Design a protein around this nucleic acid. Structure first.
Ligand SMILES: NC(=[NH2+])NCCC[C@H](N)C(=O)O
Ligand SMILES: [Mg+2]
Ligand SMILES: [Mg+2]
Ligand SMILES: [Mg+2]
Ligand SMILES: [Mg+2]
Ligand SMILES: [Mg+2]
Ligand SMILES: [Mg+2]
Ligand SMILES: [Mg+2]
Ligand SMILES: [Mg+2]
Ligand SMILES: [Mg+2]
Ligand SMILES: [Mg+2]
Ligand SMILES: [Mg+2]
Ligand SMILES: [Mg+2]
Ligand SMILES: [Mg+2]
Ligand SMILES: [Mg+2]
Ligand SMILES: [Mg+2]
Ligand SMILES: [Mg+2]
Ligand SMILES: [Mg+2]
Ligand SMILES: [Mg+2]
Ligand SMILES: [Mg+2]
Ligand SMILES: [Mg+2]
Ligand SMILES: [Mg+2]
Ligand SMILES: [Mg+2]
Ligand SMILES: [Mg+2]
Ligand SMILES: [Mg+2]
Ligand SMILES: [Mg+2]
Ligand SMILES: [Mg+2]
Ligand SMILES: [Mg+2]
Ligand SMILES: [Mg+2]
Ligand SMILES: [Mg+2]
Ligand SMILES: [Mg+2]
Ligand SMILES: [Mg+2]
Ligand SMILES: [Mg+2]
Ligand SMILES: [Mg+2]
Ligand SMILES: [Mg+2]
Ligand SMILES: [Mg+2]
Ligand SMILES: [Mg+2]
Ligand SMILES: [Mg+2]
Ligand SMILES: [Mg+2]
Ligand SMILES: [Mg+2]
Ligand SMILES: [Mg+2]
Ligand SMILES: [Mg+2]
Ligand SMILES: [Mg+2]
Ligand SMILES: [Mg+2]
Ligand SMILES: [Mg+2]
Ligand SMILES: [Mg+2]
Ligand SMILES: [Mg+2]
Ligand SMILES: [Mg+2]
Ligand SMILES: [Mg+2]
Ligand SMILES: [Mg+2]
Ligand SMILES: [Mg+2]
Ligand SMILES: [Mg+2]
Ligand SMILES: [Mg+2]
Ligand SMILES: [Mg+2]
Ligand SMILES: [Mg+2]
Ligand SMILES: [Mg+2]
Ligand SMILES: [Mg+2]
Ligand SMILES: [Mg+2]
Ligand SMILES: [Mg+2]
Ligand SMILES: [Mg+2]
Ligand SMILES: [Mg+2]
Ligand SMILES: [Mg+2]
Ligand SMILES: [Mg+2]
Ligand SMILES: [Mg+2]
Ligand SMILES: [Mg+2]
Ligand SMILES: [Mg+2]
Ligand SMILES: [Mg+2]
Ligand SMILES: [Mg+2]
Ligand SMILES: [Mg+2]
Ligand SMILES: [Mg+2]
Ligand SMILES: [Mg+2]
Ligand SMILES: [Mg+2]
Ligand SMILES: [Mg+2]
Ligand SMILES: [Mg+2]
Ligand SMILES: [Mg+2]
Ligand SMILES: [Mg+2]
Ligand SMILES: [Mg+2]
Ligand SMILES: [Zn+2]
Ligand SMILES: [Zn+2]
Lengths: 203, 110, 116, 69, 141, 53, 181
RNA sequence: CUGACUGGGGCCUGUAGAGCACUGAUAGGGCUAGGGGGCCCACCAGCCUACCAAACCCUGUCAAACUCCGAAGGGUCCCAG
RNA sequence: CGCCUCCUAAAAGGUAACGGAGGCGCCCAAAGGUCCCCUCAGGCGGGACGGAAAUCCGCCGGAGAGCGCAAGGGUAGAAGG
RNA sequence: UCCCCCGUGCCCAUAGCGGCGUGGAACCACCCGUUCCCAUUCCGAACACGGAAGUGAAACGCGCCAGCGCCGAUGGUACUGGGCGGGCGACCGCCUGGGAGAGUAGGUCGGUGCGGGGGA
């Protein structure tokens, strides 16, 4: 789907001021424009959790414009785990590199055997026209076992959308589960004490 | 990645420039030999001479000898006297050596 | 390294130096020199260069020798080892192949005595 | 070429047993041989010296067919 | 248990614990993480205790990700000695951990299973923790 | 300097005065060093020979 | 330069068949011989009889060119090897001597090889160069059984302007290089 | 009148922070030598591995004696108070 | 217990502890002066004896080699051969 | 003064790797030879000399491609000079001035000085 978001312009307000008014500081750019924006933090969050960096948000700018953007960058407060800034990349009619979700289809057999579907990539970075964003890219993982894997080479892509990461890059894998019946061997596991690396006339 | 030609050119020419004298640079092709005197601080050529210029004859060694006197002739008329001989990637021998001996015959001090 | 792939000694008679070629014994020595009419008693030194090339040509073209003799005789042994026949089982162990007893002796095919 | 260190190459007459004369260059003005390219079995197509055999085994035995049928 | 296979030096100086995490602050592998709320040296024994508790709750199934490694050698003088006469003997290894870090992630398990295993794990650790779910903010990192 | 690596004087072969002190490895250079050095009495260069210190 | 059957055979018979077989559009694109390198990797005359001059005098007769010493870049415990020790010979044959050597090689030397099956066709550099080995030195006409003592072979590099194996196989086989397969 | 301090200007720096390009550490995954294990073989090669795992890569990290980066400041000279 | 190198040392210099790590008490007659020439380690492919590694050929390869010996700095446009 | 080539510098990869295409009148290479000066721990490969049939194949030069490599904002953050607070502490905040690195947008298949040869 296609989401919307009121956005506003800023000039000399301080970010800390904005963030205590419940507003999330931002920036908008492409090869033609660059503008300091903000978006009401509660309204942004409700949009971003649905529309990560895959689907389009159109920013209803207060000057009457409405610009089609992808979120390009979200800076988090490493301490508090909270969005602290957004990059809004304003789309044009030319292609773009973006992330598109991977939608893992089917139930792996090595998962039925007890394994765990390790989904190394939940999206793939893929160049595609903006008039042409797929909702996702289905992936058949039903025939994987322990420890089989998929790669971007096995990605069957829809029309008008080309891989922009190396197809040799693993995307899914099925590993063995955690098992208690290994604890006793791992607990009774003598460890050779660490080795310093020889310095001087010894090497 | 440099050649033995490029490292040589650099090496002899780095030592020449350290002395700070005007350098009598010589270029030598399969056919012609070219010589210009260069102020490295202003990065400018002061006076030139070549077999291609004067349209000199045949035997490359005597041809190089005459471009040397010719380089000298105009050189001294411009106040140039002392100089440093830049053999670049060339061994001081034959053609390049003939240009030197002729340039000295003119009165270039080196 | 003249004939025939080997270099037969001088200072000796041809017939006897021809034995010093894999594939030629006394018999094939007195069947070569007679065919190309060179006295068997003639010393390899005193060989005429025409005599030599007549001695070369006969033995090199009528009989399998040196390399190629060693070649097939291996394949003969190779194939017995592969078709799983009892002569091949004795080859795949190094054991005597021609009926001999093995309680004692058989030191030629076994080599020196492996103690215990 | 440096001088004093190199053995002179001169016109040379090689001679093989098959009457082949090579108009080459060498350090010995006249060398013999017992073989040359003009006679070697590998070179001369397949002058299969002796055993142009067929083997003849392992079916060519055929001594004989007189067993009953 | 976890410790460097080998090192360039046997004894690190103590250093400080000021500031928020350098990195490791977003869920990067699994579905739920255990985030550190205050700084500490996390010993290897603590890390192992928290792991074993998570596999023991999972009984069989799921996958534990450990995103902290104890590489700092921890030193202690023998008991009842005076100061001086050189640095004490390395007696263990710790992972410096600062506010924001995701020490452990889990995958392959029900929400109740991850919330619970991660809770039990927290109790083994010398600090406060929160339990976080892989977010879109995490994906955007 | 050690037992093998000795200290030694250089004596001007002409006027015979020692003008220089140096060292050598008498296992590596077992022969008496001969060196052209400047002699300040002769006031010219002269061969100097190693002479016991 | 000298008149040599091989050199002449290159220009008259080998050059135009190559143009044919590949369709070059410049005369310099056609494969040429650049050099042949011979190297007795002796390694036996290290601390043993360092008068390997016996083989230097041997190669000088084969090539007509005095080979140069090869010495070790490092010491090696297991080879009894010390840095700088003489361990072989190398001689770079070009032009007329390269042609004259290959001529006798393809004519006389290769056939005298014990149980000659032909050159190993999968020994092409990958870059369009070729290398072969030898286990003896009597293989050549200039080394008579009398004057020789020990058995030493050599390594041979035949370097070509051809960029590929496929082109280089064509040049060498056209010149008369007997390939087993 | 040169001083502490201060203005402006130049030059020197490798810390805080950060980073992983080097030297080391490092969890997992991919890949892929060498090993361990299993079918098959001793006739020399094969086939399978939810086993340990080199090197490479990928995601994610660590370091007083790591640095592709790199502040604030600090130092010093000139002119000015 | 003197001397050298690194860190601690808070980006000038300096800075302590019975703080963390290593070295020196030599050596070279060339391993010194100058002139000339030369360019490594390593990886892939190829080559008798010949291997992980001896020597040879090709391609890639800015310096990860080398610089007598610790460590640091420096360094192929050489201080290396 | 305008384009092309040849020298020789400056900036110091926005200048590189790779791919493609193009250039021989001129110039530059290779080239043609090794008598001669000179040269090879062997080799006219290199260095060097005398040449001028050929070729732009190699090298060089010039365009073009962003796969790599290199360069890279803006915004926000870390850190911080100076000034203040808080916590039992490990530590955490605020004011003022400064302000990264990573990353994002994006840039780049060089720019320029001097002399010489040719071209209008
Ligand atoms: N503006 C400054 N100089 N700040 C330095 C740090 C101040 C204070 N300790 C803080 O954490 O906020
Ligand atoms: Mg929120
Ligand atoms: Mg030349
Ligand atoms: Mg016999
Ligand atoms: Mg402390
Ligand atoms: Mg503790
Ligand atoms: Mg402690
Ligand atoms: Mg102490
Ligand atoms: Mg202690
Ligand atoms: Mg402990
Ligand atoms: Mg942390
Ligand atoms: Mg707790
Ligand atoms: Mg031609
Ligand atoms: Mg091959
Ligand atoms: Mg080639
Ligand atoms: Mg012979
Ligand atoms: Mg005053
Ligand atoms: Mg003052
Ligand atoms: Mg003052
Ligand atoms: Mg001031
Ligand atoms: Mg640091
Ligand atoms: Mg730090
Ligand atoms: Mg690293
Ligand atoms: Mg990275
Ligand atoms: Mg730290
Ligand atoms: Mg760090
Ligand atoms: Mg430090
Ligand atoms: Mg930078
Ligand atoms: Mg400053
Ligand atoms: Mg200041
Ligand atoms: Mg002061
Ligand atoms: Mg200042
Ligand atoms: Mg004043
Ligand atoms: Mg002391
Ligand atoms: Mg310091
Ligand atoms: Mg200090
Ligand atoms: Mg300091
Ligand atoms: Mg300081
Ligand atoms: Mg001072
Ligand atoms: Mg003490
Ligand atoms: Mg000591
Ligand atoms: Mg010397
Ligand atoms: Mg020196
Ligand atoms: Mg190499
Ligand atoms: Mg090899
Ligand atoms: Mg080898
Ligand atoms: Mg071999
Ligand atoms: Mg080094
Ligand atoms: Mg040492
Ligand atoms: Mg130019
Ligand atoms: Mg081109
Ligand atoms: Mg073209
Ligand atoms: Mg032309
Ligand atoms: Mg033309
Ligand atoms: Mg001559
Ligand atoms: Mg003459
Ligand atoms: Mg000479
Ligand atoms: Mg030449
Ligand atoms: Mg000509
Ligand atoms: Mg071209
Ligand atoms: Mg060139
Ligand atoms: Mg930069
Ligand atoms: Mg950046
Ligand atoms: Mg900024
Ligand atoms: Mg403060
Ligand atoms: Mg703060
Ligand atoms: Mg501030
Ligand atoms: Mg500010
Ligand atoms: Mg910074
Ligand atoms: Mg930046
Ligand atoms: Mg990151
Ligand atoms: Mg462009
Ligand atoms: Mg570029
Ligand atoms: Mg280019
Ligand atoms: Mg320029
Ligand atoms: Mg300029
Ligand atoms: Mg111009
Ligand atoms: Zn013949
Ligand atoms: Zn005197």
């Amino acid at each position: 789907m296609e989401y919307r978001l009121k956005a506003y312009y800023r000039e000399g307000e301080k970010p800390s001021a904005l963030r205590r008014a419940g507003k999330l500081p931002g920036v908008m750019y492409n090869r033609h424009l660059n503008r300091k924006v903000y978006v009401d933090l509660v309204e942004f969050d409700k949009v971003f959790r649905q529309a990560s960096i895959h689907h389009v948000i159109v920013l209803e700018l207060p000057d009457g414009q409405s610009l089609p953007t992808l979120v390009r960058q979200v800076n988090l407060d490493k301490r508090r785990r909270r969005p602290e800034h957004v990059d809004f990349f304003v789309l044009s009619d030319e292609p773009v590199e973006m992330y598109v979700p991977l939608r893992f289809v089917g139930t792996p057999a090595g998962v039925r055997a007890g394994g765990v579907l390790q989904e190394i990539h939940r999206d793939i970075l893929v160049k595609v026209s903006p008039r042409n964003i797929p909702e996702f890219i289905e992936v058949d993982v039903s025939g994987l076992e322990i420890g089989d894997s998929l790669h971007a080479s096995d990605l069957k892509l829809p029309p008008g959308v080309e891989l922009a990461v190396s197809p040799e890059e693993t995307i899914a894998a099925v590993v063995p589960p955690e098992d208690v019946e290994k604890l006793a061997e791992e607990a009774a596991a003598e460890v050779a004490e660490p080795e310093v690396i020889k310095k001087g006339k010894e090497e | 990645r440099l050649t033995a030609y490029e490292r040589r050119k650099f090496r002899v020419r780095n030592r020449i420039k350290r002395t700070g004298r005007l350098r009598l640079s010589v270029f030598r092709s399969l056919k012609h030999i070219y010589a210009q005197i260069i102020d490295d601080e202003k990065g400018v050529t002061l006076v030139s001479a070549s077999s291609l210029a004067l349209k000199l004859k045949g035997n490359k060694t005597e041809v190089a000898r005459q471009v040397g006197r010719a380089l000298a002739e105009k050189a001294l008329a411009l106040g140039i006297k002392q100089v440093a001989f830049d053999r670049g990637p060339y061994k001081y021998h034959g053609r390049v050596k003939a240009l030197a001996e002729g340039a000295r015959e003119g009165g270039l001090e080196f | 390294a003249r004939i025939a792939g080997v270099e037969i000694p001088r200072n000796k008679r041809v017939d006897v130096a021809l034995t010093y070629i894999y594939g030629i014994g006394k018999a094939r020595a007195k069947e070569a020199l007679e065919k190309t009419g060179i006295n068997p008693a003639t010393r390899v030194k005193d060989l005429t260069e025409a005599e030599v090339v007549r001695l070369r040509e006969y033995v090199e073209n009528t009989w399998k020798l040196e390399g190629e003799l060693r070649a097939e005789v291996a394949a003969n042994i190779k194939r017995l080892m592969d078709i799983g026949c009892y002569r091949g089982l004795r080859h795949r162990r190094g054991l005597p192949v021609r009926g001999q007893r093995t309680r004692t002796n058989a030191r030629t095919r076994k080599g020196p005595r492996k103690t215990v | 070429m440096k001088e004093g260190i190199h053995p002179k190459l001169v016109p040379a007459r090689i001679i093989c047993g098959c009457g082949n004369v090579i108009e080459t260059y060498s350090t010995k003005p006249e060398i013999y041989v017992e073989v040359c390219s003009k006679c070697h079995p590998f070179y001369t197509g397949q002058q299969r010296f002796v055993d142009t055999e067929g083997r003849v085994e392992r079916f060519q035995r055929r001594y004989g067919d007189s067993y009953r049928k | 248990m976890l410790m460097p296979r080998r090192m360039k030096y046997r004894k690190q100086q103590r250093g400080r614990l000021k500031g928020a995490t350098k990195g490791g602050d977003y869920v990067a592998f699994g579905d739920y993480g255990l985030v550190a709320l205050e700084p500490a040296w996390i010993t290897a024994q603590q890390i192992e205790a928290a792991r074993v508790a998570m596999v023991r709750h999972f009984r069989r199934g799921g996958k534990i990700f450990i995103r902290i490694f104890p590489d700092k050698p921890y030193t202690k003088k023998p008991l009842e000695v005076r100061m001086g006469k050189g640095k004490g003997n390395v007696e263990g290894y710790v992972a410096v951990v600062k506010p924001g870090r995701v020490m452990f992630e889990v995958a392959g398990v029900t929400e109740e299973q991850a919330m619970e295993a991660l809770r039990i794990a927290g109790h083994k650790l010398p600090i406060k923790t929160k339990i976080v779910r892989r977010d879109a903010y995490d994906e955007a990192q | 300097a050690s037992e093998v690596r000795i200290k030694l004087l250089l004596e001007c072969t002409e006027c015979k005065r020692r003008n220089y002190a140096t060292e050598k490895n008498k296992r590596n250079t077992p022969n008496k060093l001969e060196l052209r050095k400047y002699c300040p009495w002769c006031r010219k260069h002269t061969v100097h020979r190693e002479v016991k210190i | 330069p000298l008149d040599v059957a091989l050199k002449r055979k290159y220009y008259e018979e080998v050059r135009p068949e190559l143009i044919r077989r590949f369709g070059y559009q410049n005369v310099w694109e056609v494969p040429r011989l650049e050099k042949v390198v011979i190297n007795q990797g002796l390694g036996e005359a290290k601390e043993d009889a360092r008068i390997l001059e016996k083989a230097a005098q041997e190669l000088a007769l084969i090539t007509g060119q005095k080979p140069a010493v090869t010495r070790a870049k490092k010491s090696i415990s297991n080879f009894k090897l010390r840095k700088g020790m003489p361990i072989g010979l190398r001689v770079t044959l070009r032009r007329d001597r390269m042609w004259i050597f290959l001529e006798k090689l393809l004519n006389v030397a290769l056939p005298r090889i014990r149980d000659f099956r032909g050159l190993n066709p999968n020994s092409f550099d990958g870059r369009g160069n070729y290398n072969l080995g030898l286990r003896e030195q009597l293989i050549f006409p200039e080394i008579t059984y009398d004057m020789v003592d020990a058995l030493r072979g050599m390594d041979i590099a035949v370097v070509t302007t051809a960029e590929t194996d496929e082109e280089a196989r064509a040049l060498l086989e056209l010149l008369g290089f007997p390939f087993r397969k």
